[model samples]
Structures are given as structure tokens and as C-alpha cells.
Target chain A: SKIEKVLYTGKTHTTSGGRDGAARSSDGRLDIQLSSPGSAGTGTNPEQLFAAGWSACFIGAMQLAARAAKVTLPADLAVDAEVDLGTAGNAYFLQARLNVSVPGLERDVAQRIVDAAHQTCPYSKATRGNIDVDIRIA
Target chain B: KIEKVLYTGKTHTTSGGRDGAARSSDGRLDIQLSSPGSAGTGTNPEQLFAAGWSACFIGAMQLAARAAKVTLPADLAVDAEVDLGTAGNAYFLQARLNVSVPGLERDVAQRIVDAAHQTCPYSKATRGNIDVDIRIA
Candidate 1:
């Protein structure tokens, strides 16, 4: 019985809409539309929510890696993640590709930073074996 | 190689800042995260993502059980545990799901849970990506 200290908790509620309704955070910081794919619906889905969170979390993780290495990263380092929701059999799944651009750094160094970030990023760790995540240092 | 994208979500944020926020276009969800271990008294990304995955997984389970002609107790409950940890320089997540089918046999409940894991979108999305433990109680 290890006691885990709760550092933080994020909460959200979903209605009966399932995949086509709104999911809002308790604090009201996250409010978005949930729509089925190809409906060209004006809202977002879980894939987008995952992508956004993962990308942000990865960038933050990269900064942690950089600080430990005594390397200074460009202020404008950017991470763009594309999340795809695909179907197999009768179920749906997700895949991702993250394009990272760390300006003012050598290609290899930037690649290293990205790799380190992947090692530490919570999002990367969460989906490590379950999804095909392609990370590219562009 | 199969292209059956039902939807796409996009977002951008500042690195290492509490000012960063994420929102869906339809205005159904909005979230802002604090720095790791900041103890800032606000929500973090893990819990937000966890909640989304849990809700979706439970819903998917219902769908799967229905398809299999299994009648689950209306009060069945699913508890999702998302654990955050660090290994060397990497931060990772682990998940455990405790499912309660109060009136069902243990073996039968376990089978339904297994089917749900395969059929749930959240489970499929994170199939080999993370470490997940599932239990039927």
C-alpha cells in the first residue's frame, strides 16, 4: 500500500452525446465541440485533445531535458502534432506524427533533444507501445 | 495504410508555462495546465487526458457488451487509474482499470472487459503505446 501523493487533478464531464458531444473541464479551461469524423463539424474530437496535450507536454519535456544538459534551446522551438483517428474491424484507433523544429540548433542535436523529450514526456510514455508515433526533427 | 479518419484535433502551447491552454473548436472543452510539480492548485494535463480516455472507454465497453448480447448491470462502475512516473530522464504514464460488475460471475465479467479493451477507441489508440493493467472485481 504505497501512498501516492496527488500532485494535481484535472476533471471533465461528458454528456450522452458520446463521440459527438461536448467535454468540458471542471474549471472551464477546456471547452470544445465533439463531432464525428468527416462531418466537417465545427468542433474538435478526442484525437485533437490528445494531440494538443501531447504536443504541449512534449515541448515542456524537451525543455526539462535541455536544462539538465546545460543546453540552451531556441525560444521559438515548435512542436506540431497531427493526430489521426482510424478504424479497424469495428473499432477506432489513433496514430500520430510529431514534427519538431528546434531552430538555431544542429540537426543531430535537435534530434537528440527530441529523443530525450520522448523519453521524459508523459504523453510519449502514455502511448509508447499502443500507437505508432512517428517523431521527426524538421 | 487504411485512411478512415473520423476526426482530427489540433493544438499549440508555450513550453513550460501555466499560461498555456487547450480548447476544442466546438467550445465543449477548455483546459490550462500548470508546470510539473508546481502544486499550483489547478488541473494538469494527465488528469484531463485520463478523464477523456476513461469516459470514452466505459462508453465503448457498453457498446461492445451490447453487441455480444451481454446484459451488464446498470450500476456497473469502472475506475481508471492514471499513474505518472519518471524513469531516468523520461516521464511516463501507467494505467489500471478496476471494473465492477456486481451481479455477474467473475469469468464472465472478465471476458466482457477484455472485449471492451479491444473495441474501445481509447484502448485501440493506446494499444501498445503504454502499460495498462485491467481487473474485474
Candidate 2:
């Protein structure tokens, strides 16, 4: 908490630096800077933000879908969202790679739940045209 | 995270039990988060998401040892503010968590903005009926 008093700003832009950026605030731990060229438009840069947001959202959707279906999924359902940044024509498009692991629910049932989750995820829809999502149930 | 540039709906029907013909859609899966969710990938997305929220807020906490000059352990990592599901009138639940900085004590470290509801851009931006939470690992 005392860190804020000393550090002026909370974040900084990466100009000459690599992906990791230097913090304007406290020095406890450095904020690792990761970036994707804006020119590409691959959305790779936004993947981290998207993954964090989507994974959570998708998981939530899965739970609700499961409940309504009356099927119980694994307590620890691991969903990994991986966004690939690459050049497409002149633009950079992204692909969301999701690996899901849920208990209780059978493979087919889990897949059904995942489908519902995908349909429900705002992040999934927001970037539907912007990026491609490849999801698998493990 | 790995991104999928192209997708073909091309739905496939898998037989169901008790419930007739459950429709399951299979598309594609792609991402670029550090191989091995942990290690090997220096502070990948998940870590960043977790750390970003925690780090960003801790920087604001001014009490969780917000030292003007703080040093972090090489292995110190933050967990994602995993929203378990969707919010109100929504679809799923979510999990929000902040793995307590390894070297720090819970009593002292818990003071940071550990709740996704209180922070997290996604949480704030998507105020839906989804369920989410934040915690210290």
C-alpha cells in the first residue's frame, strides 16, 4: 500500500523497451511487458487480456449450461485460452486456443456445455470476426 | 494464448444418453500462452492477467507493503482473477484469485486489491450476471 505513495504512476508505456515494461509505481515486482505490433491487428497483443476475460467468462457459461442440463462438471475445470497473433492478408488476426478439463461430466456432455459457454461468452462473440477460437475438451 | 485465424462451423452430431441426439459443435483450438502454464514462459498472459490486476491494484493499495522500492522474488507469480461463470441473467460462474505473493505473509499481503469485483477491467467492464471471484493462492 505504501508503494503508491512513492511511485507516481501505476503503469508505463513500452517505447524502446521489450515486452516487459518498467512500473512507475512500487518496485516489489516488475510488470512484465508483452506486446503485439499495432500494425498487424492480429489481436495477439490483446490475447492476454482476452484470455483472462474469456476463460473466466467461458467457464461461467459452462457452469450455467451444466446446471440447466442437470449435469455436474468437474470442480476444477481448467480452461486455457491461447491467442495466436499472425499476419492475414495485410491484417493481423488472432486464434483462441482453449484446453478444457472438467470432472464428472462425460466428454460429450462437457463438449455440450462448452458449446453453450462459447455461445454465451461476450469475449468469444466480440472477437468472433477479429479472431478464431479453437476449443478442445481434455 | 494461441489464436485461431480461421474456423469452419461444420457441426457434428454426437449421440446422447437419455437425452436424444445432443448437438455438440467442434471447431478449432489455438493459443500462444507460454508453453507449460508455469515456468519456461516468462510471465505469460495468465500470469500477467493475474499479476496485472494484482500488481496494478497493489500499486494502488498503499498498504500491502507498497514500498517505494520493493524487490520481487524471481518465482513470485500472481494467479488469474478467474470469474467462475457469467453474471446476473447470465450463463456461467467465474473464479477470481490472487495467489498470495510467495514470500509475503497472508495477513500482510491480503490487503492488496484481491477481489476482482473491486478491480479487474473485465469484471468492471462486463457487469453481467456471471459469477466470479478473487483469491490468494
Candidate 3:
């Protein structure tokens, strides 16, 4: 249910408690100015980061899944992720949709790969039953 | 958990698997994403998770502090270390969150952090699914 040993630690810090500030990684690889999702300010927010991370990771997971299925993934394979931040009364939550595109594969086969990925991807597993996730083959 | 949606952020991934292009819909977040093992000038997904979670967590703590009639320090910061590791052939993530609310006593700071864990969207999303250690620094 958990990792036995850590391979890498991504260290990060936020300058303030709100979204209208900044965030940077310890390695200096990622540094960005953040703004609230609902604001008109032109800055990246947490929702965008979540969407980017999951979309990238989902592609990686699909590669592993294709390997397991003995299928060669197309060079143009892609995943489009959308994350929404919402509030109910006074509590906040998230929901997502992952739309996948696998041009060279059959519909059923691509769906199988995506299904396998949803079962194995760390982000998919992390947000499993807690949020509404819709996976589609596009 | 919604009365109505507040905001929706979107992104797309391309060819290179972990070494690909990830860009937001409006070009706010655009970067070359490299896998963790690679020393590429790109950022990894793990780093994205770390930054987003830490940023959102501090905001959650501020919400909790306000509810508790506490004023958080202006320099309050959160340092989150998210580990990407494997068990057998499966990769998973574990984390440690270090919160720094300068000049606040441990008892009070700990209470706010605990409440944030309950309220933060990131904390609630990963609840019981991964190993997370949240503490006051």
C-alpha cells in the first residue's frame, strides 16, 4: 500500500498562505508566480499544476501499460487533463477528466491501455474514490 | 464537493512520456517535463505535485487559523517534501510537510496544521491513499 524506499524527494516551498504569491522547488527547476484560480491575475495556480502533473504522469503510465499489453504506443500519443476546484458550503474539493488520444491503436485496445493505466497511475490511485474522475479515449 | 465550480485549469501532454511537453490551456504553466532520474533542465511531475500541494496547504492553514481566531504570521511558510519511490514495480508517492509559523507556540501551531489536514483539498484527496507526515517546523 506504500513505497518501501524513496527514490527522490521533490522539495518545494510557498511564499505565502494564499494563491496570489509564489512557489519554487528546492532544486530551482520549478519557480512560478501563483494567482488564485478565480482571480483575473495572469499567474499559474495550484489547479494548473495538478493538471500538468497528472497529464504528464498519465502519459507515462500509459506507456507502461502499453508495454505490459505488448502494444507499441504511437509517437503522437497524448493526454489532456482538466481539473476543477469547487466548494460545497464551506469545504473545497477537486474533480478531473483525462481525455486520451492514441491515434494508431484500435478503440478497444486503447481503452484497455487507458483502463490499465487508471488502475496503476499514482495520481489516479491517489485521487481514486475521493474525487470524480472521468477517463475517455479521444 | 460542490455547490458550484470555481475554476477549471487544463493541460495537455505530448510524445516523450515522462520527458514531454506540458502546457496549460492559456500558457500560464509551460515547461519541459523530465522524469525524476534524469538531470534534464526540465521539471518533473513530482516537483509539480510538491509545489502545488505546499502552496495550497498554506492557504488551507490560513483558513483554519481564521476559523480558530488566530492570526498567522506574515512569514508563514510550508516546506513539503514529496518522495517518488517504488514498491516492487509499482511507483507511489509519500510525503512530509514541514510548516513554519514563526513565533507561534507548538501547541497552537500543531492544532492549526491538524485542522488544515482535515480541510485542505490536497490532504483530503490523498487521505488514506498515501503516507503523509504533517508537522510543525
Per TM-score, the best of the predicted structures is 3
Instruction: Give the DockQ (2 decimals) of all models.
Output: 0.34, 0.05, 0.77
For every candidate in turn, the CA RMSD to the true structure comes to 4.3, 14.7, 1.7
Tens digit of per-residue lDDT, candidate 2, span B47-69 = 32343344433333332333423
In candidate 3 the C-alpha lDDT for residue B71 amounts to 89
Q: In candidate 1, residue B89 scores what lDDT?
A: 39
Error of 2 at A133 (Å): 1.6
- Sort order, lDDT high to low: 3, 1, 2
- Which candidate comes out best when scored by lDDT? 3
Model 3 misplaced regions, further than 4 Å: A17-19
| Candidate 2 error regions (>4 Å) | A1-19, A22-46, B1-137
lDDT tens string, model 1, B1-137? Answer: 33576655655544434445554444434556666456454345665575567556666767867777887785665555566665543456667766767898777777788887877767776667667787874
Worst 10 residues of 3 chain B by lDDT: B12-21
Error of 2 at B124 (Å): 22
Clashes of each: 26, 66, 0
User: What TM-score does candidate 3 get on C-alpha atoms?
Assistant: 0.94
Worst 10 residues of 1 chain A by lDDT: A1-10
Candidate 3, residue A136: how far the Cα is off, in Å: 0.6
Write down the DockQ of candidate 2.
0.05
